[PDB]
RNA sequence: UGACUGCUCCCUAGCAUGCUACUACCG
RNA sequence: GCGGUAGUAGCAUGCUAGGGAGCAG
């Protein structure tokens, strides 16, 4: 199954609450939204896969922003251990393959 | 790209108008809500612009409200 | 993790046992050395992971507190943030009617009601100086919001009607200036 | 939340739990605030206290940072590291901190009851911002020791300017003149009601009328005070004399009725700040108008 | 964790055994040392484990009983609030008209929809527009539900007073139209 | 002012089971 | 010489409890 791309983009761009117009505070919203939008990469039309790719790039940008933006004024140093899984397609491809985890 | 921009601007304008306690006047709030809901359903980009002018006139015709000149000198609106 | 006494003890035991074994020796010495070595090795190996878990947990806690503080800060500047954002997008739109009315309001000529769209209905503005009247009103027609309007009434701060012929360069500065023009939208 | 400790030049989220203005002290700065005196309680974005239900620990020196929370000594899940350790207190800006050489600024003047002359002595032996902290703490102590006296009230009324007055339960009374304006409020059953401004000096209780009043039963008069907010701009401006009379709108005529005005006019021409020491009749009557013209 | 009952015996045996070892005696004393210290640590093990289990059990019990007490306090306060609300709303029943219509019933039961219709003292009317207004509450007194009501106040959607002299056909488009009219029962209840 | 269900992702705490490892006791 | 037992550490698996978020009718 795949949803309407307009619904996913509208969920991305229009939020209730003000604290959700700062992606670094909630990165787990976009992970779920990209989980919902994965099967759009097999569609013959080309923008449909571009939605999923755009979500992955935005997730990576948000993570980089958080790490640098926190290392700068403070002095806390962040690590990128098992975090890169969220901007590669293999984490999302496993949710539509019959093997039932968690 | 010239239509989604005006829809986003209309959403922001309605939020700004709501922040200024406009819904304490039923007629003005009803007119503003009607205009905002009509802009988002538009299909061509001329009716949306005239409705945008009408909606912005509501914010401009409030003397105290905001400072047009300071908000125009902050490397913002010309 | 090379800043704990356990590491020092384990390193000294490792060096001593390694030197003794490389020199070559019997079985009892090896057994005693390993029985005195393994306890120190376990002592080191426990803290080697406990310290890592403590450090990562502290980092996560500082992250969470920074996020909470930033959200609390952000939810307290919404009015100014929204106004600045709105005027930035209004710049980026780049429309002639919007620019016209924004400049007019910035110089002092603001409306008094909602701008109508029909070929009818009344519009009222305030003109505070003679220069704005010179720019906008020329003749008997009115140009506002990239449109054309027809003047039908002029009212002063004293609410007395002023005819159009009266307003002139030197003939004006004896009047209550915040005039109120009421016009209708020309076809 | 995020304020500023400036003697150590350290942004902070911490503050002393039991002190005058909830003052802002950085990690090491809160540390020598809590070891040079007794202030064993701090406040952060969240307050430090054991989070198990029913537990109660005011102290911070023995709390631990557990599973995204805080736990304690008497009730101890100790899978953690201590909050107070290694010359510092856990918080943001735990790395970008400097400390204080003069350890006992707060420990000296924020630890007394804010009434000795030593407070003002040290306040004058301060910096601009340190003396700002001093002045704000003087206003705070003024209000906090004014809010420890009674509230006058008229319960049965008499002829105006000669009434009766009972006061409060056990509290003392402040000085007597019109220094303290008795501007309270009236209560009908639960709310506050228009009263006016009053002042009690002579007592049979003779009142002075800042306004003409028709006093009713129970009317209460007392100064109800808020707290002065922190200020964001310096008091005095640093002394920098002007290059020229650039940027002025000069005049042609010269004041003559005032015989000591022209040289001082030129001074205002190139003086940035101006204070003098004078009784009545020192230009306060006419020199202001002299500059105005 | 340092003053357990077996701690004294364990520490004394360890000290004596290690003193014997430092004395440089034969291997038999070393074997006895090893056996005694092994059994001493083995017996200290359960004494150090069971106590730690028991303390956590006791702490859990304390927490559960505290939360039970808090729940009971909350129940008591909600009961008080409900009782207060009921006894407060009781005091407006108009116990003469209600009694008059209850006694007329053949067994004491009456529909609930006719109690406000015959015993209420105040009436509220919401009017969409002027055409509906001039057909329902025109004038100063009108009739509804076989009773006579007289107007007492008129407000608008913004809750501001409106006088009947300006509710006209010409002035209609200048009002927040969801008007609310308040009246009193004439000759009967208020 | 915020209903009833269903599914999924993330973080922490506890319990149970299994794997490996280090000492010690017993035969 | 092999096994059993008692603690200790790391790792994995499934449930329960708490919190944050996403979609659908
Ligand atoms: Zn303090
Ligand atoms: Zn400091
Ligand atoms: Zn506790």
Swiss-Prot record, chain A:
* Catalysed reaction equations from the record: RNA(n) + a ribonucleoside 5'-triphosphate = RNA(n+1) + diphosphate; a 5'-end diphospho-ribonucleoside in mRNA + GTP + H(+) = a 5'-end (5'-triphosphoguanosine)-ribonucleoside in mRNA + diphosphate
Cofactor entry = Mg(2+)
Q: How is its activity regulated?
A: Inhibited by Remdesivir antiviral drug (GS-5734) through non-obligate RNA chain termination.
Region annotation RdRp Thumb: where it falls in the sequence: 1-102
UniProt function note: RNA-directed RNA polymerase that catalyzes the transcription of viral genomic and subgenomic RNAs. Acts in complex with nsp7 and nsp8 to transcribe both the minus and positive strands of genomic RNA. The kinase-like NiRAN domain of NSP12 attaches one or more nucleotides to the amino terminus of NSP9, forming a covalent RNA-protein intermediate that serves as transcription/replication primer.
Q: Quaternary form? A: Interacts with nsp7 and nsp8 to form the replication-transcription complex (RTC): nsp12, nsp7, two subunits of nsp8, and up to two subunits of nsp13. Interacts with nsp9.
Q: Which protein are we looking at?
A: RNA-directed RNA polymerase nsp12
Report which gene this protein is encoded by.
rep
Curated annotation (Swiss-Prot), chain B:
Name all RdRp Nsp7 cofactor domain ranges.
Answer: 1-78
Native organism: Severe acute respiratory syndrome coronavirus 2
* Name listed for the protein in its UniProt record: Non-structural protein 7
Q: Which residues of the full protein are shown?
A: 3860 to 3937 of 4405
Q: Point out the signal peptide segment.
A: none
Q: Subunit structure of this entry?
A: Interacts with nsp8 and nsp12 to form the replication-transcription complex (RTC): nsp12, nsp7, two subunits of nsp8, and up to two subunits of nsp13. Eight copies of nsp7 and eight copies of nsp8 assemble to form a heterohexadecamer dsRNA-encircling ring structure.
Task: List locations, semicolon-separated.
Answer: Host cytoplasm, Host perinuclear region; Host cytoplasm; Host endoplasmic reticulum
Summarize the protein's role. Plays a role in viral RNA synthesis. Forms a hexadecamer with nsp8 (8 subunits of each) that may participate in viral replication by acting as a primase. Alternatively, may synthesize substantially longer products than oligonucleotide primers.
From Swiss-Prot, chain E:
Q: Which residue intervals correspond to the LRR repeats?
A: 30-57
**Where are the stretches annotated Disordered?**
1-73
What compartments host this protein? Host cytoplasm, Host perinuclear region; Host cytoplasm; Host endoplasmic reticulum
Q: Which domain of life is it from?
A: Viruses
Stretches assigned to the RdRp Nsp8 cofactor domain: 1-190
Coiled-coil region list: none
Record's subunit section: Interacts with nsp7, nsp13 and nsp12 to form the replication-transcription complex (RTC): nsp12, nsp7, two subunits of nsp8, and up to two subunits of nsp13. Eight copies of nsp7 and eight copies of nsp8 assemble to form a heterohexadecamer dsRNA-encircling ring structure.
User: What is the role of this chain?
Assistant: Plays a role in viral RNA synthesis. Forms a hexadecamer with nsp7 (8 subunits of each) that may participate in viral replication by acting as a primase. Alternatively, may synthesize substantially longer products than oligonucleotide primers. Interacts with ribosome signal recognition particle RNA (SRP). Together with NSP9, suppress protein integration into the cell membrane, thereby disrupting host immune defenses.
Q: Output this protein's name.
A: Non-structural protein 8
């Amino acid at each position: 199954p795949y949803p309407d791309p307009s619904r996913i983009l509208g969920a991305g761009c229009f939020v209730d609450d003000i604290v959700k117009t700062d992606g670094t505070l909630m990165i787990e919203r976009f992970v779920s939204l990209a989980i919902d939008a994965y099967p759009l990469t097999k569609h013959p039309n080309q923008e449909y896969a571009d939605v999923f790719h755009l979500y992955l790039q935005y997730i990576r940008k948000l993570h980089d922003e958080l790490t640098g933006h926190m290392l700068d004024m403070y002095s806390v140093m962040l690590t990128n251990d098992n975090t890169s899984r969220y901007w590669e397609p293999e984490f999302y491809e496993a949710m539509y393959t019959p093997h039932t985890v968690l | 790209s010239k239509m989604s921009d005006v829809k986003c601007t209309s959403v922001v304008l309605l939020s700004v108008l709501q922040q200024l306690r406009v819904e304490s006047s039923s007629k003005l709030w009803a007119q503003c809500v009607q205009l905002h809901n009509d802009i988002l359903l538009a299909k061509d980009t001329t009716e949306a612009f005239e409705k945008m002018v009408s909606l912005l006139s509501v914010l401009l015709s409030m003397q105290g409200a905001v400072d047009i000149n300071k908000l125009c000198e902050e490397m913002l609106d010309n | 993790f090379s800043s704990l006494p356990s590491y020092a003890a384990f390193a000294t035991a490792q060096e001593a046992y390694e030197q003794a074994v490389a020199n070559g020796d019997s079985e009892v010495v090896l057994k005693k050395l390993k029985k005195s070595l393994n306890v120190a090795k376990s002592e080191f190996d426990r803290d080697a992971a406990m310290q890592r878990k403590l450090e990562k947990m502290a980092d996560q806690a500082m992250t969470q507190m920074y996020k909470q503080a930033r959200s609390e800060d952000k939810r307290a500047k919404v009015t100014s943030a929204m106004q600045t954002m709105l005027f930035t997008m209004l710049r980026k739109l780049d429309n002639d009617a919007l620019n016209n009315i924004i400049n007019n309001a910035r110089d002092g000529c603001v409306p008094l009601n909602i701008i109508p769209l029909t070929t009818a209905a009344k519009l009222m503005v305030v003109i505070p100086d003679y220069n704005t009247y010179k720019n906008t009103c020329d003749g008997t027609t009115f140009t506002y919001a990239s449109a054309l309007w027809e003047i039908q009434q002029v009212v002063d701060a004293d609410s007395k009607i002023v005819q159009l012929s009266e307003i002139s360069m030197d003939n004006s500065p004896n009047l209550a200036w915040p005039l109120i023009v009421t016009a209708l939208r020309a076809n | 939340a995020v304020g500023a400790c400036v003697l150590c030049n350290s942004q902070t989220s911490l503050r002393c739990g039991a002190c005058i203005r909830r003052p802002f002290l950085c990690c090491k700065c809160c540390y020598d605030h809590v070891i040079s005196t007794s202030h064993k309680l701090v406040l952060s974005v969240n307050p430090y206290v054991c989070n198990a239900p029913g537990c109660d620990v005011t102290d911070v020196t023995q709390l631990y940072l557990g599973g995204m929370s805080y736990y304690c000594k008497s009730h101890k899940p100790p899978i953690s590291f201590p909050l107070c350790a290694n010359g510092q207190v856990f918080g943001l800006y735990k790395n970008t901190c400097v400390g204080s050489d003069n350890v006992t600024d707060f420990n000296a003047i924020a630890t007394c009851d804010w009434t000795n002359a030593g407070d003002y002595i040290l306040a004058n032996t301060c910096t601009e911002r340190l003396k700002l902290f001093a002045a704000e703490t003087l206003k705070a102590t003024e209000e906090t020791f004014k809010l420890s006296y009674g509230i006058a009230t008229v319960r049965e009324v008499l002829s105006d300017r000669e009434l009766h007055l009972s006061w409060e339960v056990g509290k003392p009374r402040p000085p007597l003149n019109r220094n303290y304006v008795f501007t309270g409020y009236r209560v009908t059953k639960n709310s506050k009601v228009q009263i006016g401004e009053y002042t009690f000096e002579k007592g049979a209780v003779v009142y002075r009328g800042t306004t003409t009043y028709k006093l009713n039963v129970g009317d209460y008069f007392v100064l109800t005070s808020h707290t002065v907010m922190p200020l964001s701009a310096p008091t005095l401006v640093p002394q920098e004399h002007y290059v020229r009379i650039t940027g002025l709108y000069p005049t042609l005529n010269i004041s003559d009725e005032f015989s000591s005005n022209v040289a001082n006019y030129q001074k205002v021409g190139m003086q940035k700040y101006s204070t003098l020491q004078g009784p009545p009749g020192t230009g306060k009557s006419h020199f202001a108008i002299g500059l105005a013209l």
